[PDB]
Design a protein around this ligand. Structure first.
Ligand SMILES: *[C@@H]1O[C@H](CO)[C@@H](O)[C@H](O)[C@H]1NC(C)=O
Ligand SMILES: *[C@@H]1O[C@H](CO)[C@@H](O)[C@H](O)[C@H]1NC(C)=O
Ligand SMILES: *[C@@H]1O[C@H](CO)[C@@H](O)[C@H](O)[C@H]1NC(C)=O
Ligand SMILES: *[C@@H]1O[C@H](CO)[C@@H](O)[C@H](O)[C@H]1NC(C)=O
Ligand SMILES: *[C@@H]1O[C@H](CO)[C@@H](O)[C@H](O)[C@H]1NC(C)=O
Ligand SMILES: *[C@@H]1O[C@H](CO)[C@@H](O)[C@H](O)[C@H]1NC(C)=O
Ligand SMILES: *[C@@H]1O[C@H](CO)[C@@H](O)[C@H](O)[C@H]1NC(C)=O
Ligand SMILES: *[C@@H]1O[C@H](CO)[C@@H](O)[C@H](O)[C@H]1NC(C)=O
Length: 536
């Protein structure tokens, strides 16, 4: 076996010669964990060469069996492949040894079969696609929900070619290109651009990619696999991470604290290593994040340093988070003004963190694991306004109990304190929030579980479809919204103009009269019953 990879104007695929098939221990430092189950090839249409595409594999604990306690305890693994394209292509999947379902199910790609292979015709789109290929005979039941999911997931990331804004042109100035292996000196380099060409790089579990203050761009080539985590020291007007390679946190222990020797943090200090971190002075910065796959975060995926987060905005496109089997593996922060689109999230904690104003997020595919809501706007009261989240397909959920804080639209209790609902702020308001075209495939948690820790005004749910609910038994499916009060003066928190439209469960539209019985919306406090409107 030697692989043949495409590199033409229509298709680009890649391989790694240090691929290691391994499902229980850490791979060698210079090796890349490879699926032993799935083999993928790609061929531009029409059908008259098939080129090999590397199938990466992430596993719970990353081979560190002593870290499995910090996962949900399932035996699921997650394989994925990426390729670049500019024309319709056929993806050919073979198994080392049944019909498939493609999620999101709205995609409707043609699927064909022969003796030993599955063929998926992926049409070209300028924003690409991110999807799951789910073999019927590989599905298992995840207790206690009974959610039916791949034991061995295969994710397909078809992306458009890289242009001069996401790939440094050849002959680019002041660029450094580290050689494969241990990467050193990037924290003190005078380069402005760091280029990771195809190959394997690592920082070990006791270091990370601290980028010097002159670095404004890190590029992960397709075929580059980097073991590490990114921290920009530059306070410049733009910092950029781009390219279609992988940044993998697999060498870090869960909750690794870079200020305590990268050992597991002492007592939940929230100083766990982020996959993306940046630094602000007293002027504006834009974080551009494009193309990259992040795998196996040891903690929250991202946070910027400083106490002046209005100065940061994000522009995120064609980005993936995979193999996030650990707890507290949050999605990105979306700072004020952020535009985020065409993203894949595997997450076992808060997915879409609606913490900041003037944000637009669209075309998101989410594999929610077992903890935290899809959308989060609790923890701390905020002034937050003018948000659109549109076209979010939650292709799986696997909650277990109420303590997981389940739900599509959630705002959990106040973090500084957890009588129960009396630490709100009546002086703060969340306004003009639109959540539109959400799909929950398979069994789902509740539509919403919202603590109004500050006032709510003009919140619109428009088109949300739930295929089915998780069992009543596990207390994850009833929606609620209890009355809250102000911390200092006991003034009641208000909820105003909260509308629900186009909400279905199965093929049944939810109205005022069946909201409780069919939609399981049975916990709206009487104080807010007049503020919640069913348009139908
Ligand atoms: C594909 O070819 C381009 C030059 O056209 C080169 O920059 C790139 O590294 C190649 N990619 C792979 C995966 O071989
Ligand atoms: C993995 O766990 C599932 C339960 O979710 C079980 O059905 C399946 O047999 C397991 N596979 C093993 C132990 O290989
Ligand atoms: C740069 O990083 C290395 C580890 O990669 C660290 O030992 C060194 O102290 C750092 N240099 C500075 C000036 O912080
Ligand atoms: C968001 O934009 C609105 C007006 O469109 C403005 O009033 C407000 O200051 C902005 N908020 C933030 C945090 O940028
Ligand atoms: C309300 O939110 C939308 C985004 O959904 C934004 O376009 C609009 O400007 C916001 N309204 C106001 C008055 O700022
Ligand atoms: C809200 O403002 C009032 C004064 O108008 C103040 O008494 C109260 O402490 C504030 N609430 C909070 C939670 O800080
Ligand atoms: C909701 O779905 C309907 C039917 O597909 C569509 O016409 C409408 O535009 C959608 N609403 C929004 C706000 O996108
Ligand atoms: C579900 O909720 C009720 C109310 O708190 C409780 O009595 C029950 O034990 C909970 N757990 C279940 C049914 O597993």
């Amino acid at each position: 076996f030697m692989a043949v990879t495409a590199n033409n104007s229509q298709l680009l695929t890649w391989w790694h010669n240090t691929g290691e098939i391994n499902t229980q221990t850490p791979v060698a430092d210079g090796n890349v964990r490879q699926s032993g189950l799935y083999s993928v090839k790609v061929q531009t249409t029409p059908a008259s060469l098939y080129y090999d595409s590397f199938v990466y594999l992430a596993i719970p604990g990353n081979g560190m069996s002593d870290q499995l306690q910090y996962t949900q305890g399932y035996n699921q693994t997650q394989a994925w492949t990426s390729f670049l394209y500019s024309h319709d292509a056929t993806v050919k999947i073979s198994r080392n040894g049944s019909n498939v379902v493609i999620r999101p199910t709205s995609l409707n790609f043609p699927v064909r079969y022969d003796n030993q292979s599955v063929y998926i015709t992926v049409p070209y789109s300028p924003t690409g696609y991110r999807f799951s290929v789910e073999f019927d005979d590989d599905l298992i039941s995840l207790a206690p929900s009974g959610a039916r999911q791949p034991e061995n997931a295969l994710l397909i990331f078809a992306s458009p070619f890289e242009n001069s804004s996401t790939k440094p042109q050849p002959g680019s100035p002041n660029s450094i290109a580290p050689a494969p292996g241990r990467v050193l000196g990037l924290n003190t380099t005078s380069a402005s651009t760091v280029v990771f060409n195809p190959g394997v790089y690592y920082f070990t579990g006791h270091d990370h990619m601290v980028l010097s203050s002159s670095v404004t761009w890190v590029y992960f080539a397709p075929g580059a696999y980097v073991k590490g985590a990114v921290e920009f020291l530059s306070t410049a007007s733009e910092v950029k991470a781009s390219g279609h390679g992988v940044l993998s946190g697999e060498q870090y222990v869960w909750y690794a604290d870079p200020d305590e020797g990268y050992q597991k943090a002492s007592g939940a200090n929230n100083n766990g290593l982020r996959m993306w971190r940046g630094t602000l002075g007293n002027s504006s910065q834009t974080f551009v994040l494009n193309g990259v796959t992040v795998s196996a975060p040891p903690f929250n995926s991202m946070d910027w340093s400083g106490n002046s987060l209005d100065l940061i905005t994000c522009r995120v496109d064609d980005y993936k988070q995979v193999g996030a089997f650990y707890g507290q593996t949050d999605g990105l922060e979306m700072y004020p003004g952020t535009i985020l689109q065409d993203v894949f999230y595997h997450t076992d904690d808060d997915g879409l963190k609606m913490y900041y104003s003037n944000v637009t997020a669209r075309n998101i595919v989410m594999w929610k694991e077992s903890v935290a809501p899809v959308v989060e706007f609790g923890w701390t009261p905020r002034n937050t306004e003018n948000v659109l989240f549109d076209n979010v397909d939650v292709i799986h959920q696997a909650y277990a109990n109420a303590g997981n804080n389940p739900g599509i639209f959630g705002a959990v209790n106040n973090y500084l304190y957890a009588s129960a609902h009396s630490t709100g702020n009546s002086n703060m308001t969340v306004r003009n929030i639109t959540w539109s075209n959400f799909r929950a495939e398979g069994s789902s948690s509740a539509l919403f579980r919202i603590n109004p820790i500050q006032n709510l005004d003009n919140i619109s749910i428009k088109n949300v479809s739930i295929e089915s609910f998780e069992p009543l038994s596990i207390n994850t499916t009833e929606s609620w919204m209890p009355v809250w009060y102000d911390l200092n003066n006991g003034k009641q928190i208000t909820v105003t103009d909260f509308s629900i439209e186009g909400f279905t469960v199965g093929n049944t539209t939810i109205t005022a009269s069946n909201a409780a019985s069919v939609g399981r919306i049975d916990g709206v406090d009487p104080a807010y019953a007049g503020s919640v409107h069913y348009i139908d």
